[PDB]
Amino acid sequence: GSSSRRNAWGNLSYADLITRAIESSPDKRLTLSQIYEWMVRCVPYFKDKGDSNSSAGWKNSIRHNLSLHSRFMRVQNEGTGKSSWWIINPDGGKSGKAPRRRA
């Protein structure tokens, strides 16, 4: 039957795993590369996928999960680089591309 309770370590979904890494980060915004490593640090799933091609594999799927609802939001660099950071949307938090000060 359906799993009402799940192991919050191994039975995590892809979105959860991204979150796991992102929450274990400094500013909650990380590139997919740094999410990947931050994940491998604590994740059970991407340990295996860390060694295998499933890294540059399930990472492709992970981005689809970053398109779920509005559960995640994507942040760009303020200028110190031209790369994107990725976060789970808590409210806005990092204010990435969010016009707070319109004046």
How many other CB atoms are there within 10 angstroms of residue 52's CB atom?
12
What is the Cα–Cα distance from 25 to 40, expressed in whole angstroms? 12
Q: Are strands 84-88 and 72-76 parallel, antiparallel or unpaired?
A: antiparallel
DSSP 54-83: THHHHHHHHHHHTTSTTSEEEEE-SSS-S-
CATH number 2.170.130.10 is the correct assignment for the domain at 1-103: no
Where along the chain do its domains lie?
1-103
Q: How far apart are the first and last CA of the chain?
A: 55
Distances from the Cα of 16 to the Cα of 5, 20, 42, 71, angstroms: 14, 6, 12, 11
Among 30, 16, 57, smallest CA distance to 7 is for 16
Among 9, 84, 15, smallest CA distance to 47 is for 9
Phi, psi of 85 (to 5 degrees): -110, 155
Which tokens in the block code for residue 76? 């760009």
